[PDB]
C-alpha cells in the first residue's frame, strides 16, 4: 500500500546568471557558489488518505514539530560592553532568534563580539557569529550572510551566550519549521477560474460541504537544509512529523484504554434512550488531533449520533464529544479501533516516506 506517492524536491538556488547578483555577492560576501544551507521546496502527492491526515501532517511540519532556535541566555547581552545605543537587546535578540538553523547538536553556544574601530557604520553579518562550545562545526548551521544589526562608528556590541533552544512553532513562531507553498485536491475537478463566471468561486467543481477528497498534493518549503544533505534532511523532517502525530495519538490512547478510574479527561455518560456520550478533554491540544480523531471516528462509525470537537482559542484545550447508540464498552472499543487506524496510517506514511525519498 502506497499512500504517499512520488515527491519532488527542489532547493532554492541563487542564479548567478544575473550580473547584479554575482557582483553584489562577490563584492561583499566573496560569494561565488550556492550557500551552505538552502531553502528547499518539497511537493508531495498522497492517495487514498483523508484530508484530515494530510492537513495534520502539514500543520505539524509547520509549527508543531519540535524545532531549534538560536537564542540569548539571560545576561548574555553585555550591557556594559555593548556601546552601540541603537542595537537594543530586543532588536538583536529578535534578529538572532529567526535565523533558520539546521542544528544536529544542541550544545553549540555562539558568541558575538564586534568592535567598530573605524568611522564607517559597520554592519554585523552572520559570519561575525563566533562559536565557542561543543564539537567544532565542520558545516555551518546557518548561512553566513544574515544581517544582524549594524554598528555606529566607535560603538561595540558584545553578546557572549547565544545557545540553541528547543521548542515548537506553536508557542513561539521562531520555532516554525516549514512554510506552505501548495495544497490542492487532485481528485476534485477544477473550473477555469480565469473566466469571469468562475472568478468568485474557489474553482473546485464540488462544494466543500459535500466534498470528501482522497487524493491530495501538499507542498511545503523548509527554510534551511544543508546543500549536500537535502534528501536526508527532508526525510528526517517527515519521519519526525509522523512520529510526533503517532506519539500524540498514543497519548490520547493512553487515557482511552482506561475506561475506569475517572481521570478528569474522560467522562462517560449513559443518557436517555440507552445512548452513550463520551467527552474527551486534552489541555494544549489543537485542531490537528481533534480533526484527525473526528474524521477517523466518523469513518469508523458512519451512523454515529454525533461526533464533534472544539478547540476554543481560550481554555487552550480540545473537547471531543462523541454520542453513539451503543454501550460504553462498545463505544470505547470502536473509538480504540479508530485510534489504531490513525496510528496505522501514519506508520504507513512514515514507511512510504522512507521508500520514496531515500
Q: Which residues bind another protein (CB under 8 A)?
A: 12-18, 20-21, 23-25, 27-29, 31, 35, 38-39, 41, 86, 91, 94-95, 98-100, 121, 123, 125, 143, 145-147, 149-150, 173, 176, 179-181, 210, 221, 223-224, 275, 298, 302-306, 308-310, 312, 321, 323-325
- What is the Cα–Cα distance from 64 to 244, expressed in whole angstroms? 8
Q: What angle do CA 350, 355, 356 make, to 5 degrees?
A: 100
Q: Is residue 289 within 8 Å of residue 282, measured between CB atoms?
A: yes
**Cell digits for 271?**
443518557
Shorter beta-carbon distance to another protein: residue 193 or 310: 310
Shorter beta-carbon distance to another protein: residue 230 or 353: 230
> Looking at residue 197, what DSSP letter applies?
G
Closest CB 333 distance from another protein, rounded Å: 18
Shorter beta-carbon distance to another protein: residue 193 or 347: 193
CA 305, distance to chain mean position in Å, is 34
Closest CB 350 distance from another protein, rounded Å: 25
Shorter beta-carbon distance to another protein: residue 176 or 352: 176
The phi and psi torsions of 265 (rounded to 5 degrees) equal -130, -35
Shorter beta-carbon distance to another protein: residue 17 or 117: 17
List CB contacts of 58: < 8 A, sequence separation 6 or more: 178, 180, 183, 218, 220
Closest CB 2 distance from another protein, rounded Å: 25
Helix (H) / strand (E) containing 231: helix 230-256
Shorter beta-carbon distance to another protein: residue 179 or 267: 179
Shorter beta-carbon distance to another protein: residue 177 or 349: 177
Concatenating the DSSP letter of every residue in 288-319 gives HHHHHHHHHHHHH-TT-SEEEEE--TTTTEEE
Shorter beta-carbon distance to another protein: residue 47 or 93: 93
Quickly tell me which residue has 473546485 as its cell: 204
Closest CB 181 distance from another protein, rounded Å: 7
Q: Is residue 278 within 8 Å of residue 335, measured between CB atoms?
A: yes
Closest CB 15 distance from another protein, rounded Å: 4
Shorter beta-carbon distance to another protein: residue 28 or 130: 28
Closest CB 293 distance from another protein, rounded Å: 13
- What is the Cα–Cα distance from 245 to 53, expressed in whole angstroms? 9
- What is the Cα–Cα distance from 149 to 11, expressed in whole angstroms? 28
- What is the Cα–Cα distance from 215 to 234, expressed in whole angstroms? 22
Closest CB 203 distance from another protein, rounded Å: 19
Closest CB 61 distance from another protein, rounded Å: 12
Other Cβ atoms less than 10 A from the Cβ of 235: the count is 19
Q: CA 18 → CA 15, 21, 22, 27, 293, distances in Å?
A: 6, 5, 6, 14, 51
Q: Is residue 245 within 8 Å of residue 56, measured between CB atoms?
A: yes
Closest CB 183 distance from another protein, rounded Å: 14
**Cell digits for 212?**
470528501
Amino acid at each position: 500500500e502506497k499512500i504517499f506517492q512520488n515527491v519532488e524536491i527542489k532547493p532554492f538556488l541563487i542564479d548567478f546568471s544575473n550580473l547584479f547578483i554575482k557582483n553584489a555577492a562577490k563584492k561583499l560576501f566573496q560569494l561565488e557558489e550556492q550557500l551552505p544551507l538552502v531553502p528547499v521546496n518539497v511537493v508531495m502527492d498522497f492517495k487514498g488518505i483523508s484530508r484530515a491526515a494530510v492537513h495534520g501532517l502539514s500543520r505539524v511540519l509547520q509549527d508543531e514539530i519540535p524545532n531549534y532556535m538560536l537564542d540569548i541566555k539571560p545576561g548574555g547581552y553585555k550591557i556594559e560592553d555593548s556601546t552601540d545605543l541603537f542595537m537594543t537587546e530586543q532588536f538583536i535578540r529578535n534578529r538572532i532568534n529567526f535565523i533558520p538553523i539546521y542544528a544536529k547538536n544542541e550544545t553549540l553556544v555562539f558568541a558575538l563580539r564586534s568592535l567598530n574601530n573605524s568611522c564607517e557604520v559597520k554592519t554585523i553579518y552572520s559570519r561575525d557569529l563566533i562559536q565557542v562550545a561543543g564539537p567544532k562545526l565542520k558545516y555551518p548551521i546557518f548561512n553566513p550572510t544574515f544581517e544582524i544589526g549594524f554598528l555606529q562608528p566607535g560603538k561595540s556590541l558584545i553578546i557572549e551566550d547565544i545557545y540553541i533552544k528547543k521548542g515548537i512553532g506553536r508557542k513561539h513562531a521562531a520555532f516554525n519549521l516549514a512554510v506552505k507553498t501548495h495544497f490542492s485536491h487532485l481528485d476534485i475537478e477544477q473550473y477555469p477560474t480565469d473566466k469571469k463566471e468562475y472568478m468568485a468561486l474557489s474553482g473546485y467543481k464540488q462544494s466543500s460541504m459535500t466534498s470528501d477528497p482522497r487524493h491530495h498534493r501538499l507542498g511545503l518549503c523548509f527554510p534551511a537544509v544543508p546543500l549536500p544533505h537535502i534528501n536526508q534532511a527532508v526525510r528526517t523532517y517527515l519521519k519526525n512529523a509522523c512520529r510526533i502525530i503517532i506519539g500524540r495519538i498514543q497519548s490520547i490512547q493512553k487515557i482511552y484504554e482506561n475506561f475506569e478510574e475517572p481521570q478528569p479527561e474522560l467522562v462517560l455518560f449513559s443518557m436517555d434512550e440507552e445512548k452513550t456520550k463520551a467527552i474527551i478533554t486534552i489541555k494544549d491540544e489543537t485542531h490537528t488531533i481533534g480533526n484527525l480523531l473526528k474524521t477517523y471516528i466518523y469513518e469508523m462509525i458512519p451512523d454515529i449520533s454525533f461526533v464533534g470537537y472544539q478547540c476554543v482559542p481560550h481554555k487552550q484545550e480540545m473537547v471531543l464529544t462523541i454520542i453513539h447508540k451503543a454501550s460504553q464498552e462498545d463505544l470505547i472499543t470502536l473509538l480504540e479501533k479508530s485510534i489504531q487506524n490513525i496510528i496505522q496510517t501514519f506508520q504507513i506514511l512514515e514507511k512510504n516516506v522512507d521508500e520514496l525519498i531515500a
